[PDB]
Symmetry: D4
Subunit: 205 residues, 8 copies
């Protein structure tokens, strides 16, 4: 599996002249105001991935941010609620053309309450995600090989997952539902950054 | 005393509703729209009067009411519009797409409390006392009691005033775009409820 | 008025009727530990019979005839309990029953409060005072407060049943309610047999 | 051994001139108004099973429904509360002669709180049920062999379980209790469909 | 009338009796942290003695005589606590006790409310006011409200014990209650030794 | 491992001319008024055991009851609260000379909250209790070899556990505490039968 | 009758605070300092008078108030200083480091209760009734109501008296050094909150 | 292959502990210091060897150990020193005041996890397997088993290495002063436990 490791940014957009890009991040934790962005992962869906180490205090990443702001390119996430928050917090740009495989799973895999990436990859693709490195020092100057393979695996399969979920959403006639959820997702991420992360804004109480 | 006009089935006309925004509430036989039928629709133009419309069992249309609901030039003001939107679309087939919800607005602005119900908000923002005693009553009754009628009217008589104050706070705290986005999703949150996700926060990790 | 009896009704002169309201008072909620102390009856006419049951009493032929008579519907509020302590004490389980709590749950769909006090207040504007519910129901002489409270448990069940029957018809749930009432005695039996903490129909 | 797979309906009832039939279903989830019926499984208890795929929007299946309506044939379920709801919701017919092994288990296996099909088959028959395919896309146009074999395993043993539970119900003198529970079960399923699925209708509060 | 003492009773002239009502006040529920502040006594005659216990006070010989006197039953409400703090402070564990809280749990089977205020209200129509329960019981001079409150904890235990004895006999639970009172000093010891959060008889 | 299996009662007391006997029971469940006594197990501590099947409706077991009544013989249980209740409920005699290894564990193994028999046997004796048959039909006319061996394991080690616990109670100076707990245990079992099984009679609330 | 001096932005001078200890409290738009701005700072010298300082949105300095908060010769008295210290440090950039907290003091002396709120403490120790009606109010309002102003003043008018009593109790129970150590750590506990550990007991095993 | 020196009562001398920091753990009869006596004290210099000291019932002194514990020129490294500081001070009358706690350090650096136990941290940072089987055993045994001895030694063999990594991370994330204030309060937090606040977060609002 070809995994290209970069410092700071993509060197160019040559591998991403595409309509959709799979995106994930690694951080020091779940709290974007405390836990810095450490890694950004990308794949075009061709079976290879880019792993971008983000430095402490890094304010800019122009090639990555070009993709994030390109409205001709759908940003595919698994649980984009988190990735959108830390990406917009770090580089100042919120994507507004997105697809989330966790939301799509909640709308289509109605026979389960297990919507994690590992569960979804195994059921839909018979692909085994190993989570051992999720709890690791993502701020390390040199990521280990196990870390780099794990980070790549978070984006290697999102295109294939999106294709299946799009088929399920059509079959169950839920495309307009999903579209509305993906349209609000960036604001749900902004709500988290502004201080409503523990609040379901739509709940009665 | 408040002028309350009680109607059977529909408004007789829209002469009182050539306006920019209308306050709306419903009463039902309970919280489950597939089991508990729409019983009452309440409306107010914001002038201190209200219309109380009794909806019959099995009633499939309400042309004048549905006209307002579909009018993109009229903002429908709800308190917890998530519920009213679901039952209204379920009963008459039309989902409003221009809304303001004082419950969402409260959660975005009254950040110093966890109490976001209508009674609490009217008391704090307007010194108005809402009595909830009739909230649990037979809303399907053929003749509503005066207490039911006055309580149903009270749910819509203050929403314009609440919306004015919440708009001031949204602007003061720079949250107008957040609120607009939430209102834009609210009809789809209501449809999610009707489709079978009423117990699921669709944006949660688990 | 309220007629107080020891042991049994003297006769059935006041119960040549098609439906009778029934409630019980006990020393607590556990029939195998907490004996039956009182049985209250009403014909619906605004009078009640309050029957004190002795410790160790195993028979009351006039009361039990009513409980056994399939031509008389026994009206309860939460008959699940009364059916159990009555069957446990006298050995007979009534099988023609109406329960206002089940009726409430099937019709007052806008609330989770289905107790007798809430129901009497909402449907009849009648105030039930629960202060004597926690009292020594086994006292040889009941206080006037206990007697009037015990009577109030049965004075309004005919009127509640009439309104609930109207609502069950309106919402087209009559056959559902009938099936629930039909199972209620077996639900009471399940309680006496050891399943009182188990919803027998739940997945877990 | 033999699993016969059908589309739409049984071709006939040649294999079901019997006095009791084992029945299970598969759906897109637990919510009958949202999650459509996808598969109906049947067994005569002879070690063979019929697995019938149900199409989206299909509201009839005359051979199956004749069995379900036949008052001379007991329908054996495990947790019939669910199957009765989705069958009645889909086909318009509510079976009224039933046996449920889950209810039987709660009335006889008084030394445990584990009343699932897997646990009962292990204990009473030394038969292993694998539940890996319980969470799968039962709406698939073509089921996998693992799905088909799992679905069959839900009905292959219900006759044998019913025979043991009947022995136990007799031994502990609970036959009338079980019969009354089975008699109310179709109405408990109806209550679920009408909106009381989260309410123990017999509870005090 | 309430007699307020410093340190100890002056004599036992009021306590040549078969049973004495006892309660305590402390700085809190933890005996190893929260010192004994007050000890209250009543002979049952409608008067009380309120004894302020000083910080570091190691003895109270007249009080300890009553506590050690095998011919005098010590009546407590929730003796489990009083026995612990008394034994920890003065070194003596009473072994002849009656506890109205245990007695209530064994007889008032129609409720889960077994506090002293609830029991006095139901059995005696006596109103206990708990306002001073949270107050500085180590104060050098207790307020009148504190004093009256501390006395109210012992003024009615004789009358309660009499009713509870009647109920225990009626329901045939005397030997059960006696066994519970027999173990209560060791339950208190278990608390002092480090098991205050453990039901020693529970399966888990 | 020698296990003698009896119907109804011991044939005689020749193996139990001893100062202490280990006792356990098997039933159809945890509820003595619903779940009948099925098995009584006994051991003298010599590495052998007696397994006594109790018939439905059996009201008498004179040899077993002579031991339960013999004040010169300590009855050793693990969690005797249960065995005392079902034994007194079934045959009418409450033992009053008892040692409980669970209570002893709670008073000595202060470094853990795991006081089950399997945990204690592993830690104190390096003996492996297998609980697979705990959930089984103990009313069966013919018990399986696995059932009989498991039932025997419940009594084969209680003497050795008692000796160790007695040493620890002495070392930590808690002998009089344990003695009072054992003295009250028959009444705790009685309280259970009378209707307080869910109530800690000594709790503030 | 209680004299309350209301200021915009800052104290005009320190003439009323040439003292050894100052009572301090704050009002905000809520409990989350990164979202909910500092709206009011209240001060009292213990003399029965109070100063109520309205803080503007985006205000970053208040040099006279901040001098008080930085002056190591002046103990700042708080009730639940954990919160005030965090919002004050977040807003003005200075963390006070000589503090007394009546809530910590209460937890170490009122061992017979789990109710350690200011209302509860004032009633028991002083027979003073604190009314909490305005706690949930719009503290960012341009003009505070008389009710809000009197409530804000009441948070500081009694803290000197509470501190005296708690100091007596801490000496009596021989816990002065414990309290001192808790106070010394309190600014770091507040800093931990601002840094992202507000929901974590940093000293707990799990 | 691991040199573990076992002693009764005390170290025989301090020849192996002329060092700047010593790793310490304890074993007891349980988590309650007033009921559950000190049974073992373990030490390591960080050199791959350990000392395991059995403490007798009722023993109140251990002069060589206590000299180390009192030496302000030597940092005592603990994992969850809150517990060890309590039982050591309770048993020997001396409260160490120069300390490092790897559990607190983990909570301040391993921000991506709620698993801060010694086994999880050893596995993650060092790829070292801690086997907890003997944690539930009779530590008051007159003769400890080889398994008990090896387990006890494993609690202290790696704390120097953990300390060095956590120090790197505290520097990197700029939290050194935070950690230092936490370590500074930790002896008083242990004292609070001994005095009766072991179930109370003294800094919490409620």
């Amino acid at each position: 599996t070809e995994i290209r490791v970069h410092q700071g940014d993509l060197p160019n957009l040559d591998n991403y002249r595409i309509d959709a890009v799979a995106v994930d991040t690694e951080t020091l934790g779940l709290q974007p105001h405390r836990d810095r962005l450490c890694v950004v992962q990308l794949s075009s869906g061709d079976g290879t991935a880019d792993v971008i180490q983000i430095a402490k205090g890094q304010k800019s990443a122009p090639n990555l941010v070009r993709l994030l702001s390109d409205r001709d390119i759908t940003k595919i996430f698994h649980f984009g609620r988190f990735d959108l928050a830390i990406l917009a917090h770090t580089f100042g740009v919120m994507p507004d053309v997105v697809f989330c495989t966790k939301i799509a799973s909640k709308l289509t895999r109605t026979y389960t309450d297990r919507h994690g990436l590992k569960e979804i990859c195994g059921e839909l693709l018979n692909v085994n995600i190993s989570k051992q490195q999720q709890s690791s020092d993502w701020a390390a100057e040199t990521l280990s090989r196990a870390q780099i393979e794990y980070a790549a695996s978070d984006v290697l399969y999102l295109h294939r997952l999106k294709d299946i979920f799009e088929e399920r959403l059509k079959r169950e006639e839920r495309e307009s539902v999903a579209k509305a959820c993906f349209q609000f997702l960036p604001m749900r991420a902004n709500l988290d950054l502004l201080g409503w992360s523990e609040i379901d804004i739509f709940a009665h109480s």
